[PDB]
C-alpha cells in the first residue's frame, strides 16, 4: 500500500480509525466529488458542501464498504448519487438492504483482488473511449431521465464485473 491505494486506506479507516488515511481519501476524492456534482448541475458552493458530507459518510459508514463488490471510487459515487435531489425525492435515494461483512470476516482476498482487476480493466476502457461515446455515458450520469439505457447502447466489459458481484454476493449470503 501507497498513499493512493484506496482499498487499503479504507480498511485503515475501518480497522484503526486512521485519520491520516482519511486525509488521503478526502484530498483525492473530495475535489472529484465536487467536480462531479457540478457536472450534475450543482453550483460550486453546494457541490463542496455535498463532497464534504460524502466524505463524512465515508468515515461513518466505512464498515459498509465491500471491495469484493466495488472500488472505492464506485462506493464513494454511490454515496454522492444517493444524496437528496429535492425535485426528485424527500430524502436520500432509496437504497437496498445493507449487506456488509461483519466486524469479523473480510471477503476472500482473491475476490477482492479479482474485483479490483475487472474494475481497473473497465476504468482503462472508459478512458480509451472515443469522445462522442464518452459523452453518451456522461449524459446518462449528469442530466437525463429514465428513457435511457447504458448497458444496452455501450459495449463496455460489464459482464465480468456483474458475475464478480453475483459471486461475491453469494459468498456473503453463505457466510451471513
Amino acid at each position: 500500500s501507497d498513499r493512493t491505494d484506496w482499498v487499503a486506506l479504507m480498511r485503515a479507516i475501518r480497522d484503526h480509525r486512521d485519520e491520516a488515511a482519511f486525509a488521503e481519501l478526502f484530498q483525492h476524492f473530495a475535489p472529484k466529488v465536487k467536480g462531479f456534482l457540478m457536472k450534475s448541475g450543482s453550483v460550486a458552493s453546494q457541490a463542496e458542501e455535498c463532497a464534504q458530507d460524502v466524505m463524512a459518510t465515508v468515515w461513518q459508514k466505512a464498515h459498509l464498504f465491500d471491495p469484493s463488490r466495488a472500488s472505492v471510487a464506485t462506493w464513494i459515487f454511490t454515496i454522492a448519487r444517493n444524496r437528496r435531489i429535492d425535485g426528485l425525492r424527500k430524502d436520500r435515494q432509496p437504497e437496498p438492504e445493507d449487506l456488509f461483512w461483519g466486524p469479523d470476516s473480510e471477503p476472500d482476498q482473491a475476490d477482492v483482488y479479482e474485483m479490483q482487476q475487472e474494475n481497473a480493466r473497465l476504468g482503462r476502457a472508459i478512458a480509451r473511449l472515443p469522445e462522442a461515446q464518452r459523452a453518451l455515458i456522461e449524459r446518462a450520469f449528469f442530466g437525463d431521465l429514465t428513457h435511457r439505457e447504458l448497458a444496452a447502447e455501450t459495449g463496455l466489459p460489464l459482464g465480468t464485473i456483474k458475475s464478480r458481484i453475483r459471486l461475491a454476493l453469494d459468498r456473503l449470503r453463505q457466510h451471513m
Binding site: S71, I76, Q93, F141, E149, L150, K162
Partner: protein
C-alpha cells in the same frame, strides 16, 4: 426463483440517481430481494465510479479537510418488507393506513417526493384488481404470493413493468394473499 427483473434503463436511472422517489423505492426493494439485479446495478455503478475517478478535480476552499476531520465521530423486522420499504411501513406490512377499493382490493398510498406515485396493493386469495390503463410507466413488485395478468406469472420478488400502451387486469393467484409495491408517473 425470480424471473422478472428491473429493466436495464431503470437500472441505468437508478445508478445515475435521476429517478423519482416512487420509482427508486420499488427498484431498490427489488434489489434487496434480487441478487441478480444488485449485480446488474452494481456494474452500472462501476461506470459512475470510473467517471468520478477521471473527473478533473475542483478545489475545495482552504481549510476544508481539517474542518471535516474536526467533526468526525473520530475514534467513536418483517421479511416481506425489506430494504427501503421498511422505512415506509415501520414494522408490520398488515398495519398501515389502508383504503378498501373495493371489489376485494385495499391500498396504501406511500408518502414520497417526486411526481410519481407509490402505493402498496393488497389483492387477497382469488381477487382481481379491476382493469387499469396507465397514465405513464408502471412498476409492480410482489412482496407476498403471486398474481396473473400480462403475458406472465409474477411471484414474490418478481417485477412487472407496464407501459402506457397496456390494458391489463391483475388477478391474484390462489393460496397466500398478494401484497405489492407499485409505482406510476
Amino acid at each position: 426463483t425470480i424471473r422478472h427483473h428491473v429493466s436495464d434503463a431503470l437500472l441505468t436511472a437508478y445508478a445515475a440517481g435521476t429517478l423519482s422517489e416512487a420509482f427508486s423505492l420499488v427498484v431498490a426493494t427489488h434489489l434487496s430481494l434480487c441478487d441478480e439485479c444488485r449485480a446488474r446495478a452494481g456494474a452500472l455503478d462501476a461506470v459512475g465510479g470510473s467517471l468520478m475517478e477521471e473527473t478533473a478535480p475542483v478545489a475545495l476552499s482552504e481549510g476544508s479537510l481539517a474542518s471535516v476531520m474536526a467533526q468526525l465521530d473520530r475514534q467513536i423486522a418483517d421479511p416481506r418488507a425489506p430494504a427501503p420499504l421498511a422505512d415506509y411501513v415501520g414494522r408490520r406490512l398488515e398495519d398501515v393506513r389502508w383504503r378498501t377499493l373495493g371489489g376485494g382490493v385495499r391500498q396504501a398510498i406511500l408518502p414520497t417526493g417526486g411526481e410519481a406515485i407509490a402505493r402498496l396493493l393488497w389483492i387477497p386469495g382469488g381477487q382481481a384488481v379491476p382493469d387499469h390503463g396507465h397514465r405513464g410507466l408502471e412498476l409492480t413488485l410482489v412482496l407476498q404470493g403471486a398474481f396473473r395478468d400480462e403475458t406472465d406469472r409474477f411471484g414474490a420478488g418478481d417485477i412487472e413493468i407496464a407501459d402506457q400502451e397496456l390494458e391489463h387486469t391483475p388477478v391474484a393467484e390462489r393460496g397466500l394473499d398478494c401484497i405489492c409495491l407499485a409505482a406510476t408517473d
